[PDB]
Amino acid sequence: GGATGRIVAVIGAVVDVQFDEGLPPILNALEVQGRETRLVLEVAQHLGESTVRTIAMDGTEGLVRGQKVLDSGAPIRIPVGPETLGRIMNVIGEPIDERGPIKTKQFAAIHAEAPEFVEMSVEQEILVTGIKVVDLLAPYAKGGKIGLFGGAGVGKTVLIMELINNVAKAHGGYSVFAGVGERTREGNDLYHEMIESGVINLKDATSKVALVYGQMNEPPGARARVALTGLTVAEYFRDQEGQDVLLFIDNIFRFTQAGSEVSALLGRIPSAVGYQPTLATDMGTMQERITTTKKGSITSVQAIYVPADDLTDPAPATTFAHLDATTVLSRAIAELGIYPAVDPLDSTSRIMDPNIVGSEHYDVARGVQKILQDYKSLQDIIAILGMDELSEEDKLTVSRARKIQRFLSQPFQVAEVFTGHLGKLVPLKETIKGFQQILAGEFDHLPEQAFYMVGPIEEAVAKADKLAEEHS
Amino acid sequence: VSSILEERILGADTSVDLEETGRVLSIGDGIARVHGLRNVQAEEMVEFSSGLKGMSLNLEPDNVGVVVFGNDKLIKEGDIVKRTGAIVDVPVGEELLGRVVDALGNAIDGKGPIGSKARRRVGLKAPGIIPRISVREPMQTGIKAVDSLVPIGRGQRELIIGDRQTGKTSIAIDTIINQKRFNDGTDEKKKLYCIYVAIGQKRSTVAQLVKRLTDADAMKYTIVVSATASDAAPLQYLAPYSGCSMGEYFRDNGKHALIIYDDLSKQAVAYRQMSLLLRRPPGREAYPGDVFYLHSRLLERAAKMNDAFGGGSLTALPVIETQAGDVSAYIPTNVISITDGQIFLETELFYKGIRPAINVGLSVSRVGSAAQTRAMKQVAGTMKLELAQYREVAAFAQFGSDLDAATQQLLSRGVRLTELLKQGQYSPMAIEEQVAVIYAGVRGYLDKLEPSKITKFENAFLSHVISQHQTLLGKIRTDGKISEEADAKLKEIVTNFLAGFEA
Amino acid sequence: GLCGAIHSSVAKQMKSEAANLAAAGKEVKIIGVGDKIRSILHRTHSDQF
Ligand SMILES: Nc1ncnc2c1ncn2[C@@H]1O[C@H](COP(=O)(O)OP(=O)(O)O)[C@@H](O)[C@H]1O
Ligand SMILES: Nc1ncnc2c1ncn2[C@@H]1O[C@H](COP(=O)(O)OP(=O)(O)O)[C@@H](O)[C@H]1O
Ligand SMILES: [Mg+2]
């Protein structure tokens, strides 16, 4: 069955293992023995004779040269099934919530092929997530990949927690959260939030979300294989159960960065900015497996870090290429005080089409984007000269633009600790009606301070009336 | 069942023959150093024993770097690699029409096998200065902005360069959806066989693209060739050469063909992956040296053929994205340098309001008025000169430098023609309606008419002219030139419609 | 111009007196100096200047 070979060279993940009789194929799971915890290595390149270049997933400390390694002869088989809901696991398949082992029946392998072109769903139902900036300018696709770009401290995680606490209540389909390279603090808070919110249930077999965590304390081989873990769990729940799953993968730049760290150790020539040459195709296979198919639906919201706010970096650029709804959770609009600081110009969605979202939503959205682009040109002129150089047309555009730009902001339910407001769930027709009134210009007398952290437009009218009454 | 039986047992010859092989060294990441093939020829399709092709590049005295066409798990160290015996080739026919074909020849769409007849080598040499003749036919796209400022020639290459998410693939699909009315017509010279090579995209975008083309009934010009993200880097590398070879088949038979190379930068980055894995030295932005030679072969496979060589044309239009609008990057400078026509989208006009978002003066078509109809040439040259005047006077009089009657005339005509050039997605119009509407815009009759009202003017004007003026548009499109009686008739109809527009 | 919020305040006061003289007054035919006053009055009282 297995083949016993010998470690002869060790760098992190990159462990050159010598096989002389039983060399295994690429993408294999072979365990190092003599260890406290099972040290699953992953066979890649055979380089010389004997030389499987494995990537090592755990504590590399203590790997003596010439050490015996048992090759199991398969890719990384992990537990899947309905026995993994409400149960944390890490990339080997091991349960790390100390409740016991997985009592499932079948294993699914971490490494698989994408669904072919022959069977692909082409239907697009609008996912309305109760957020004004999303449902107005880049509305989500129920059955398409959704991406939350942004820098450090821009509100990606808070927006994910809004997306769980808003959409995950609706889908009866089994959700899957995959944390890759993020804070273990956030995975802990999310696990206790899923316990208290009833989304998982530690006394019954009727929990709803599975959890995979490969957090940022992990060596790079581990973090390069977490998205694959949570994705083959959610790919089981798509294929052989037929459910409408959600897949919340935070933060896919950690996957790509762990790939770059391993590849810098793997002896491949460095590509552009400092990444690997296989940035397009490794992320290509991993993103093509995240797809809605005929057999079932995936709605996959994934948070995608950008390094040093560069959208021209290769990993965010190819991730813009691999998506159906982007949302550029910028930072400068949070310097202005708007939370989430979603750049809505650079955020688009594939589903915005007048033959899909209707003519009213499309006209309101494109008018909002027009007013904000005219405001960007005019804020160049304003930043140099001032607002006393503009005409009546230009000043009405600037005033309507600041009103709209404050009205895009809303308070979320999960970020009620930072702000003071409660969680506002804005329906779709109230978003269209509010932005349509502000765009048509019926509110040329309310202050712009009355549209900040508001929600529905009647709350904006009430905030202006309460502001005038407290000034009375 | 029984027919399946007999085709299985008669089709495979099982004709064993002694054959050159060689064992495999390091099978790294889709690259395989193969020791032994001392008679392999450079850039040759070779075959790994698990049933999968690879392409032999980088012939060295040690070993041959074969780069695989697909997955890497299915290859070990020490297995055979059989020479197929010929350069990698693409099966081309006219029964390949309307069928999504994976990058070599393998039709992965679930509609049976391809009924090909004419195998063709994919790395062929492009025609020389004698077999080519110049652009003559007006390659129309249905976009008002393209066909009135940067017109395409049947015989030509013309970029669609922009930044991400601007409307470039949408311009390419407007170009595709226009040519239905020329396929189902009468003249063979008008008819279209196009090849949409989608490089490095995602499979659901190609699936919804095929949905839009089938719902628009596009599947007789079209040949969609998908080398998506999950495909290997040589499938993404080799896919636009395959579409070029299919276009060369149609061209050398004498049928007017085109190829849209969607996301050609993905070919550039897949070939960067291939060179850096085959250990070639990196050049600039880690792209190697011959990326310009790559795209230069790929894009100079297209110009009009001589009248003694069938008369078939090829129109190469590759789509390329920059990052942050940086035209000075390596791949945009190379691919601007090889092409001549290029359509520039800046994106700030997409968020400002014009669709399709050609931001313009950067965009140029070197074949110019030679690739227009006679009517559009008679109308839309003064439009381009007026837009140049308008852009420069608005650029220095941003603040109101000097406003005489001439400057407000320039800004009035410029803003009104700017709202002429707006056009909705997936709605291409024919050349005669374009001549009619740019006649209504440039030759007076719209200069003092409240620029927000131009779009309803467009809708009601096209409704009017399609309502009771179909034979006159037939006269315009079949006579070529817009005649003087048709000129004064268009003057009278636009005056009557100005009355009915202020009615 | 190029001098701040001068003409804004002047146009505000002028049209406020014009709206106050719209009721119970009729002949609000006006005179003005400079390009900026007629340039801020091409829209609301473009008849009455
Ligand atoms: N709706 C909101 N209201 C107020 N603050 C917010 C909101 N959304 C995000 N934030 C701010 O963003 C921060 C969270 O960003 P986070 O997504 O955790 O960073 P990262 O992107 O590194 O995970 C919080 O400190 C919070 O102050
Ligand atoms: N004429 C048009 N009218 C309205 N929208 C358009 C038009 N042309 C393009 N678009 C917009 O462009 C987007 C598609 O851009 P696309 O061509 O896919 O760019 P990329 O291929 O770089 O992603 C769509 O969301 C569509 O709304
Ligand atoms: Mg595209």
Q: Tokens in use for B473?
A: 């548009």
Tell me the C-alpha distance between B455 and B463, whole Å. 12
C-alpha distance across the termini of chain C, in Å: 20
Q: Give the number of domains in chain A.
A: 3
Q: Which residues pair with A210 in a beta bridge?
A: A176
Question: Are β-strands A51-56 and A39-44 bridged in parallel, bridged antiparallel, or unpaired?
Answer: antiparallel
The answer to whether residues A242 and A387 belong to one domain is: no
- What DSSP line would sit under A126-175, residue for residue? EE--S-HHHHHHS-EEETSEEEEEE-SSSSHHHHHHHHIIIIITT--SPE
Same domain, A83 and A190: yes
| Half-sphere exposure for A331 (CA within 13 Å, toward CB) | 13
Residues A293 and A388 in one domain: no
CB contact A320 to B (< 8 Å)? yes
Name the residue facing A117 among B29, B200, B207 (closest C-beta). B207
Q: B453 Cβ partners below 8 Å, 6+ apart? A: none
Residue with tokens 């698989």: A112
Chain B neighbors (3+ CB pairs < 8 Å): A
Domain regions of chain B by residue span: 17-86, 87-372, 373-503
Using a 10 angstrom Cβ sphere, with 0-12 exposed, 13-18 middle and 19 or more buried, the burial of residue B265 is buried
Give Cα separations from B35 to A51, B43, B278 (angstroms): 17, 16, 15
- Per-residue tokens: C6: 């001068």
**Gap between the Cα atoms of B231 and B485, Å rounded:** 58
| Partner A contacted by B456 (CB < 8 A) | no
* Residue pair B296/B136 in contact by the 8 Å Cβ criterion: no
SS3 helix, strand, coil % of chain C, rounded to 5? 45, 0, 55
Q: Is the peptide bond preceding residue A79 cis, with omega within 30 degrees of 0?
A: no
Domain stops at, among A13, A47, A75 = A75
Q: Which among B355, B357, B322 has a CA at the least distance from the CA of B423?
A: B355
The whole-angstrom separation of Cα B200 and Cα A286 is: 14
Closest by CA to A305, choosing from A450, A152, A155, is A152
A18 touches chain B (CB under 8 A): no
Residues A322 and A370 in one domain: no
Residue matched to tokens 């000169």: B385
Do the Cβ atoms of A312 and B263 come within 8 Å? no
Verify that A224 and A208 share a domain, yes or no: yes
**Residues A32, A19: Cα–Cα separation, whole Å:** 14
Tokens of B448: 């003092």
Task: Determine the residue type at A53.
Answer: R
Helix axes A392-407, A428-440, angle to 10 degrees: 160
| CA–CA separation, A129 and A280 (whole Å) | 30
CA angle B248/B296/B132 to nearest 5° reads 45
Q: Give the Cα-Cα-Cα angle B369, B372, B378 (nearest 5 degrees).
A: 75
**Helix, coil or strand: residue B311:** coil
- Nearest alpha carbon to residue A344 among A190, A106, A63, A136: A136
- Select from A388, A389, A392 the Cβ nearest to the Cβ of C43: A392
**Amino acid at position B50, single letter:** S
User: Does A322 contact B282 at a Cβ distance shorter than 8 Å?
Assistant: no
Is A65 found in the same domain as A9?
Answer: yes
Task: Specify whether A85 is located in the same domain as A206.
Answer: yes
B-proximal residues of A, 77-116, CB under 8 Å: 111, 113-116
| Residue A392 contacts residue A142 (beta carbons within 8 Å) | no
Q: Which tokens belong to A336?
A: 């202005």
Same-domain check for residues A69 and A115: no
Residue A235: domain span: 76-351
- The widest CA-to-CA distance across chain A, in whole angstroms, is 89
Using an 8 Å Cβ cutoff, are A169 and A130 in contact? no
Residue located nearest, by CA, to atom 25 of ligand 1: A153
Cβ pair A118:B110 closer than 8 A: yes
**Amino acid making up residue B474:** G
Q: Which residues of B137-171 are buried (b: 16+ CB within 10 A; e: fewer)?
A: bbbbbbbbbbbbbbbbbbbbbbbbbbbbbbbbbbb
Minimal CA–CA distance to A108: which of A87, A85, A84, A77? A77
Query: Could you identify the residue written with the tokens 């467009």?
Result: B458
Q: Establish whether the linkage from the previous residue to B318 is cis, with ω within 30° of 0.
A: no
Question: Does the CB atom of residue A345 touch ligand 1 within 6 A?
Answer: no
Q: Is A408 in the pocket of ligand 1 (CB under 6 A)?
A: no
On whether the CB atoms of residues B207 and A120 are closer than 8 A, the answer is: yes
Measure A340 CA to ligand 1 centroid, in angstroms: 7
Residues 6+ apart with CB under 8 A from B374: B480, B481, B482
- Could you tell me the sign of the dihedral formed by the alpha carbons of B465, B466, B469, B470, in that order? positive
* Helix or strand (DSSP H, E) at B292: helix B291-299
Q: Quickly list DSSP for A392-453.
A: HHHHHHHHHHHHHHHHT----SGGGTTSSS------HHHHHHHHHHHHHTS-SSS-GGGGSS
How far is the alpha carbon of C5 from chain A, nearest alpha carbon, in Å? 6
**Ligand 2: residue whose CA is nearest its atom 20:** B165
Identify the domain boundary among A335, A351, A367: A351
Residue in A closest to B210 by C-alpha: A122
Q: Ligand 2 — pocket residues by CB below 6 A?
A: A 348, 352; B 164-170, 321, 355-356, 423-425
Closest chain B residue to A74 measured between Cα atoms? B73
Of B185, B161, B179, residue with least CA distance to B428: B179
Atom of ligand 1 nearest to the CA of A160: 17
In sequence order, the 6+-apart residues with CB closer than 8 A to the CB of B126 are: B297, B300, B301, B302
Q: Which ligand sits closest to the CA of A162?
A: 1
Structure tokens, B488: 């004064």
Q: A388: which chain C residues are within 8 Å (Cβ-Cβ)?
A: 4-5, 8
Q: What separation in Å is there between the alpha carbon of A330 and the centre of ligand 1?
A: 11
**Residue that the structure tokens 């392999």 belong to:** B40
Same domain, A309 and A192: yes
Resolution (A): 3.5
Contact by Cβ (8 Å): B124, B253: no
A306 lines ligand 1 (CB under 6 A): no
A170 plus A232 within the same structural domain: yes
Residues A265 and A356 in one domain: no
The helix/strand/coil state of A81 is: coil
Quote the ligand 1 centre to A341 CA distance (angstroms): 9
Torsion B233-B234-B237-B239 (CA) sign: negative
Rounded to whole angstroms, how far apart are CA atoms A252 and B411? 48
- Say whether A339 sits in a helix, a strand or coil: coil
Domain end point (choices A75, A99, A120): A75
Integer Cα distance of B406 and B412 in angstroms:
10
Query: Does A173 contact B at CB distance below 8 Å?
Result: no
Query: Which of A117, A281, A287 is nearest residue B206 as measured by Cβ atoms?
Result: A117
Residues A277, A387, single domain; the answer is no
